[PDB]
C-alpha cells in the first residue's frame, strides 16, 4: 500500500506516512532496561526509576544496534501501528555514516522486520530537497550534533562535510549551568526538561552580541518571565541569548572548535571554486537547534563578513524547518518516479546487503 518515513535523530524520532505533510509520530529516541526487561519512547521516561536510560543514537551515528531495534520495533507497532510487511520504508541517516551501519540497517530492516522495500537518504539532502533545491549547503543542527553539509546536484560532497559535536543537548546543559550561576538550581534529569523548555521558549540569537550584553547590563527591557510547572517564577536575562551564542562561540562551553559561521565558510571553501557561488546563495538551515529567532540574520551577517564583498549571500530558514528532513522524506517517498528506486526484498534476498550503496 502506502510508504513510510522514519527519521532517526539522536534525541527525537520523527516518523510517519509518506505523502503527509508532518510526522504523526514524534517521540524520544530512548530505550530503558532495569538493573520485564525492555522499555521505549515515553513509557520509558514515565519509568526512568525502575530503569536506566540509554540513547541508542549518539551524535547521529547508531551506536547500539540492539536498542535501535527496540526503537524501530516500538515505531512500527506501538507508534505508527502498522506492520513492517505491508509498507515500504524510507529511512534517514547522518552524513558520513560508515559503510557498515548502512549495511546493517538493511538486514535488520529486511531480515527482521521483513519489509517489502526500503531506501536510505542522507538527512541534509532531504532537508535541502524539501525546499525545492538540489544544490546548496545545509547547516543541519539537531540534539546531539551539527553538520555543514555542502551538496551539489543531489550528491553530498564528503571531503567538504564539516562536523561539530555540539547541539541543543549541549546548549541545554549550558543553560542549566549559567541559570544556576544566578540563584536558581537545576539538578534532576526531569528538571532539565524544564530548562530545555525555557530554551525553546525564550532564548534567541543576538544580531550583535556585545550591544546585547550592554543593553542587558544597563536596563531591564530584555528580561522575560517563565512560569514553573506549579506556582513559582524564574526570571532570565542575558542568559536568554548567551546560550545560543555558544553556537557562534563554542569557547563559552570550553570548546576550541570554530563556530557555526566559520565552519560554513570552511565547508564552502573546501569545495570547487566554481560551485562556491551557489553554496553561498543556497544556505539552508534545518534542525531543532536552528529554531532560534535571530539565527538566520546573524548567519547572514557573520557570513557576509567572511565572504568576498562581491558575494551574494542567502540564508534560507523556513518555519517548517524543525521537521524538514522528514518532510523531504515524505515528498520523496510519495513521488511516482521514485517508486522504481526502492530496494525490494527480492532485491535484497537475492543480491547482498552491499546493494544499499546508492550513490544514485
Amino acid at each position: 500500500t502506502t510508504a513510510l518515513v522514519c527519521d532517526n535523530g539522536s534525541g527525537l524520532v520523527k516518523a510517519g506516512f509518506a505523502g503527509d505533510d508532518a510526522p504523526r509520530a514524534v517521540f524520544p529516541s530512548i530505550v530503558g532496561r532495569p538493573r520485564k526487561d525492555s522499555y521505549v519512547g515515553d513509557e520509558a521516561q514515565s519509568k526512568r526509576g525502575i530503569l536506566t536510560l540509554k540513547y541508542p543514537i549518539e551524535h547521529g551515528i547508531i551506536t547500539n544496534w540492539d536498542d535501535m531495534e527496540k526503537i524501530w520495533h516500538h515505531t512500527f507497532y506501538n507508534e505508527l501501528r502498522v506492520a513492517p510487511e505491508e509498507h515500504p520504508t524510507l529511512l534517514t541517516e547522518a552524513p558520513l555514516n560508515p559503510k557498515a551501519n548502512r549495511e546493517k540497517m538493511t538486514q535488520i530492516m529486511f531480515e527482521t522486520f521483513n519489509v517489502p522495500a526500503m531506501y536510505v537518504a542522507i538527512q541534509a539532502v532531504l532537508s535541502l530537497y524539501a525546499s525545492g533545491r538540489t544544490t546548496g549547503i545545509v547547516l543541519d543542527s539537531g540534539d546531539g550534533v551539527t553538520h555543514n553539509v555542502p551538496i551539489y546536484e543531489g550528491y553530498a560532497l564528503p571531503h567538504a562535510i564539516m562536523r561539530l559535536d555540539l547541539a541543543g543537548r549541549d546548549l541545554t546543559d549550558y543553560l542549566m549551568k549559567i541559570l544556576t550561576e544566578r540563584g536558581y538550581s537545576f539538578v534532576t534529569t526531569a528538571e532539565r526538561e524544564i530548562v530545555r523548555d525555557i530554551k525553546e521558549k525564550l532564548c534567541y540569537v543576538a544580531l550583535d552580541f556585545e550591544n546585547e550584553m550592554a543593553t542587558a547590563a544597563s536596563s531591564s527591557s530584555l528580561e522575560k518571565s517563565y512560569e514553573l510547572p506549579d506556582g513559582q517564577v524564574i526570571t532570565i536575562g542575558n542568559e536568554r541569548f548567551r546560550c545560543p551564542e555558544t553556537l557562534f562561540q563554542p569557547s563559552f562551553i570550553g570548546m576550541e572548535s570554530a563556530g557555526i559561521h566559520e565552519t560554513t565558510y570552511n565547508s564552502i571553501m573546501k569545495c570547487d571554486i566554481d560551485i562556491r557561488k551557489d553554496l553561498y546563495a543556497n544556505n539552508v538551515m534545518s534542525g531543532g537547534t536552528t529554531m532560534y529567532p535571530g539565527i538566520a540574520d546573524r548567519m547572514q551577517k557573520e557570513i557576509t563578513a567572511l565572504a568576498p564583498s562581491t558575494m551574494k549571500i542567502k540564508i534560507i530558514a523556513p518555519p517548517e524547518r524543525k521537521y524538514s528532513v522528514w518532510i523531504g522524506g515524505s515528498i520523496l517517498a510519495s513521488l511516482s518516479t521514485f517508486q522504481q528506486m526502492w530496494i525490494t526484498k527480492q532485491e535484497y534476498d537475492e543480491a547482498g546487503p552491499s546493494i544499499v550503496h546508492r550513490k544514485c
Binding site: 551506536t63 560508515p98 571531503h159 562535510i161 570554530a258
Partner: protein, 413 residues
C-alpha cells in the same frame, strides 16, 4: 679549481670560494624569471622571508594561498631544489643556543672565554635530541676564521645528504649559499675550539631523515593510502569490530575513560576488551618510516584550562613559563593519540593554541585511519595510548592576533 669539490672544505676558504663562484655562475644561468626574481627579493629582504618559511604551514589552506608572502615562498622553494647536490656536503653556520632549547647564555659578548660549567650544561641539553629544522637559511661552505663574521659562540657543522637542494649565488662581492631546511638534526658531539684567539662551541650535526608532508595534505594522503589501504581490510575479524569504536563519532568517552584512569581503578571489561584490540589495530601495520605528524592540542593536555591566565601566550612570561615547565621534559598520554599528517588548521580545532609536532620513529604503533572510505576526509594518524613524547623545543608564531606554540617532539617508544 678542484674539478669536483671535496665533501668538506674544512678551513680552506680560498678553494671553497673559488669553487662556489664557478658554481654560482653556472647555477644562476639555470634559474628562470620567477626564480631569479625570487632570489632578487631574498637579498633585499631575507629575515622577513625566512620567518615566513619557518611557520608557513599552520594556517588554513585558504589562508596559506591568500598570503601575499606565499608567492615568494614557492618561488624561492623552486629555485632551491632546481639544483640538487652532486653528493653530500658539509656546511657551517652559526646558531643561537636558544634554538636548541638552551635558554640561558654560553658566555656574554665581551668574554672571549667560555665556562667549563656552561659548556657541560649545553652538552647535556643537546645530546640525544632530534631538533626539527625548517625555513630558508644562509650557510657557508668552510669554517670561519680571521676575517669572517662570527655572531654567536655556537658553530654548527652539518652534513647535508646526497640529494639536498642548495643555491650558491653572488651578492655584491661574496658568494652565498641558500638552503631550505626540512629535516631534523641530531647533535653527535660538541667541542670547544678557538678562532682569532676566541673560544667558540662547535657542534657536529647530522640529518635524520623523516617524511613531512606539512601543508601538502594530498601528497600526504597518497602516501597514507599507499600504506594503509591493504590495512583497511587485513585487520582481522575481532579487531575489525573493535576498531570501529574510537572511529565511531564519539571519542570523549574512549579518551575520558583513559584520562582519569579506568583500567586499575574502575575496571570495566566492556572497554578493556575493546582496548586490548583497538591497540592491536595500530599494532597491525606499524609505521613504515620516520614520519612527522601534527597534533593540535588543548589546554588540559598541558595542565591548564581555556580560561587559565597562563594560557595567554600573547604575553611572553607565559611562554617562558610554559618552556620551563615543558621544554626538555617527557610527557605521557593515557589516551589514543589522534594526529594528522598535515600541519593545516581546521574547523574541529580552529582555536587550539598548542601544536604538537611529532616525529615518529619507523616501526612504531600506529595507522593511517583516514584510509577507510566514508570515514574519510581529515588525514588522521592514530597513535597508541600510553605513548610518551619528548618535548625537545618550544616555538611560537602569531596566528592572526592570537599567539600559538609549536612543540617539537619525538615519540620515544
Amino acid at each position: 679549481a678542484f674539478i669536483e669539490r671535496p665533501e668538506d672544505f674544512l678551513k680552506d676558504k680560498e678553494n671553497a670560494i673559488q669553487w662556489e663562484k664557478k658554481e654560482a655562475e653556472r647555477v644562476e644561468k639555470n634559474l628562470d624569471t620567477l626564480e631569479k626574481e625570487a632570489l632578487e627579493l631574498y637579498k633585499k629582504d631575507s629575515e622577513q622571508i625566512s620567518n615566513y618559511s619557518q611557520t608557513r604551514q599552520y594556517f588554513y589552506d585558504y589562508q596559506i594561498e591568500s598570503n601575499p608572502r606565499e608567492k615568494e615562498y614557492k618561488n624561492l622553494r623552486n629555485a632551491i631544489s632546481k639544483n640538487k647536490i652532486d653528493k653530500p656536503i658539509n656546511v657551517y653556520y652559526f646558531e643561537s643556543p636558544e634554538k636548541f632549547a638552551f635558554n640561558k647564555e654560553i658566555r656574554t659578548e665581551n668574554q672571549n672565554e667560555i665556562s667549563l660549567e656552561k659548556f657541560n650544561e649545553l652538552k647535556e641539553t643537546i645530546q640525544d635530541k632530534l631538533f626539527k629544522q625548517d625555513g630558508f637559511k644562509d650557510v657557508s661552505l668552510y669554517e670561519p676564521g680571521n676575517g669572517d663574521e662570527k655572531p654567536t659562540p655556537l658553530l654548527i657543522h652539518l652534513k647535508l645528504p646526497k640529494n639536498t637542494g642548495m643555491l650558491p649565488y653572488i651578492n655584491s662581492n661574496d658568494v652565498k649559499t641558500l638552503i631550505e631546511q626540512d629535516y631534523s638534526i641530531k647533535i653527535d658531539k660538541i667541542v670547544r675550539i678557538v678562532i682569532e684567539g676566541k673560544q667558540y662551541i662547535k657542534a657536529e650535526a647530522s640529518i635524520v631523515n623523516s617524511l613531512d608532508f606539512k601543508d601538502d595534505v594530498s601528497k600526504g594522503d597518497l602516501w597514507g593510502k599507499e600504506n594503509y589501504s591493504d590495512w583497511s581490510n587485513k585487520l582481522t575479524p575481532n579487531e575489525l569490530a573493535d576498531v570501529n569504536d574510537y572511529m565511531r563519532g564519539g571519542y570523549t568517552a574512549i579518551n575520558n575513560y583513559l584520562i582519569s584512569n579506568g583500567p586499575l581503578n574502575n575496571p570495566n571489561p566492556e572497554l578493556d576488551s575493546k582496548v586490548n584490540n583497538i591497540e592491536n589495530a595500530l599494532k597491525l601495520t606499524p609505521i613504515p618510516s620516520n614520519l612527522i605528524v601534527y597534533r593540535r592540542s588543548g589546554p588540559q593536555e598541558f595542565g591548564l584550562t581555556l580560561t587559565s591566565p597562563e594560557y595567554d601566550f600573547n604575553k611572553i612570561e607565559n611562554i617562558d613559563a610554559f618552556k620551563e615547565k615543558w621544554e626538555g621534559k617527557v610527557i605521557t598520554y593515557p589516551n589514543f593519540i589522534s594526529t594528522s599528517i598535515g600541519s593545516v588548521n581546521m574547523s574541529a580545532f580552529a582555536k587550539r593554541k598548542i601544536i604538537l609536532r611529532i616525529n615518529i620513529p619507523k616501526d612504531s604503533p600506529g595507522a593511517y585511519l583516514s584510509a577507510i572510505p566514508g570515514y574519510a576526509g581529515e588525514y588522521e594518524v592514530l597513535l597508541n595510548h600510553g605513548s610518551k613524547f619528548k618535548i625537545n623545543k618550544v616555538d611560537s608564531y602569531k596566528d592572526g592576533t592570537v599567539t600559538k606554540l609549536i612543540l617539537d617532539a619525538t615519540l620515544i617508544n
